[PDB]
């Protein structure tokens, strides 16, 4: 099927507008595994498909692009996702990655420890999170909004994300946050994206495209997660990596997006329109300083 050649599935407005109770997620192919092309790690394909989808989005892509990647490490002590980001992003992009446990990576800066220890001195352009807390597997009682690392990420979106910047944050059926869904309403556009390489998981990447710093859509976060699960329960997704068969255009377009400093007073309709089309970032243009704090 055509969808098997796409990098994955994006939550459609058909399901965003629903009004339903939160139900258990029941995927027909749950936990099936796709053999991997060339035997690369599964996360190579997953991250490549997320990048391919973001290639269709209005991402801001400036010189010296500031990218932070949380949950970058593995039990194997390596970071396949970070290498994919290095392959995808402009060569002058700055990649900072982080994980609770020690690992080695191709990032420019690597920080170990809880993401709460990561001090972002200046605003960034793109946040990727693959964090997941193992205690989420200990499902007891009802599936309520989680705190965990989501408190940190929500504060980061409100304070340390450039206007025009974007986020891709991994959620699952039980690993999710009301507050993060509501913050998607402060972007020009948003969705949940599910890779074909991991279609048999309730994993999705909650995507916020072009941060506006103001409410564009009023979202009820609890109801929206219920809509996400309703979508997953209604939508056949077959495991596939066919989208990776042709990689001639995989690299992120070198858009040259300008970075401007503006006071809030000066943000008019022209500026908002440029932000919403991926044509402008607003933040400092100093040197980025990201370090480990002592808490």
């Amino acid at each position: 099927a055509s969808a098997d050649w796409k990098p994955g599935h994006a939550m459609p407005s058909l399901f965003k507008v629903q009004n339903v109770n939160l139900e258990r997620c029941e995927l027909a192919n749950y936990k099936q595994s796709i053999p991997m092309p060339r035997g690369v790690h599964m996360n190579i394909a997953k991250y490549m498909q997320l990048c391919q989808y973001l290639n269709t989005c209005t991402l801001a892509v400036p010189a010296n692009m500031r990218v932070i990647h949380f949950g970058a490490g593995s039990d194997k002590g390596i970071a396949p996702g970070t290498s994919v980001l290095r392959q995808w992003l402009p060569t002058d992009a700055i990649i900072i990655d982080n994980d609770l446990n020690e690992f080695v990576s191709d990032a420019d800066i690597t920080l170990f420890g809880d993401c709460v220890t990561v001090r972002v001195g200046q605003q960034v352009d793109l946040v990727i999170s693959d964090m997941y807390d193992p205690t989420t597997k200990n499902v007891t009682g009802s599936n309520e909004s989680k705190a965990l690392f989501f408190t940190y990420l929500c504060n980061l979106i409100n304070n340390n994300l450039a206007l025009g910047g974007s986020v891709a944050i991994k959620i699952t059926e039980h690993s999710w946050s009301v507050e993060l869904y509501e913050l998607m309403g402060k972007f020009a556009w948003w969705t949940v994206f599910c890779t074909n390489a991991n279609a048999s998981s309730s994993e999705g990447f909650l995507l916020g495209i072009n941060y506006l710093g103001t409410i564009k859509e009023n979202i009820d976060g609890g109801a929206m997660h219920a809509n996400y699960i309703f979508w997953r329960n209604s939508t056949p997704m077959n495991l596939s990596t066919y989208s990776l068969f042709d990689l001639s255009k995989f690299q992120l377009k070198l858009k040259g997006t300008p970075v401007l400093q503006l006071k809030e007073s000066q943000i008019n309709e022209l500026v908002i329109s440029l932000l919403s089309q991926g044509k402008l970032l607003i933040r400092d243009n100093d040197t980025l300083s990201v370090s480990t704090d002592v808490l």
């Binding site: 092309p37 060339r38 035997g39 690369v40 790690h41 190579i44 394909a45 490549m48 194997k76 002590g77 390596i78 970071a79 396949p80 970070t82 290498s83 994919v84 290095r86 392959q87 060569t91 020690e102 080695v104 990576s105 191709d106 990032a107 420019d108 990776l244 042709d246 990689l247 001639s248 995989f250 690299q251």
Partner: protein, 121 residues
Amino acid sequence: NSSVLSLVNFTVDPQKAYLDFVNAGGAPLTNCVKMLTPKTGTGIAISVKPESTADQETYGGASVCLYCRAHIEHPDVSGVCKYKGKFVQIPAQCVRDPVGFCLSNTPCNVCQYWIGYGCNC
């Protein structure tokens, strides 16, 4: 992995200890980060983006560096790893042990291709 990695911490010559280990039948270090690429690159050894030809595979550089993978001191006089943050092209006939391939070989300082596997100087 946990063994050969443990091993190169009990010696003053990690490169020799790794190579002797795999030359004597020991299992190469696994979990090197092999990328998926259009095999349409220039074929040079170390590159800012993947450059595999049809006869090569590309790996993330940190993952094929013994010193990175074992978290030990790099030997370069600059202190800067030659691989980390870049991509490393490995001949397809050598993918059984990318770490050992890198320990065993040097890119041409003039043409940047692997001596013996691409350099035509």
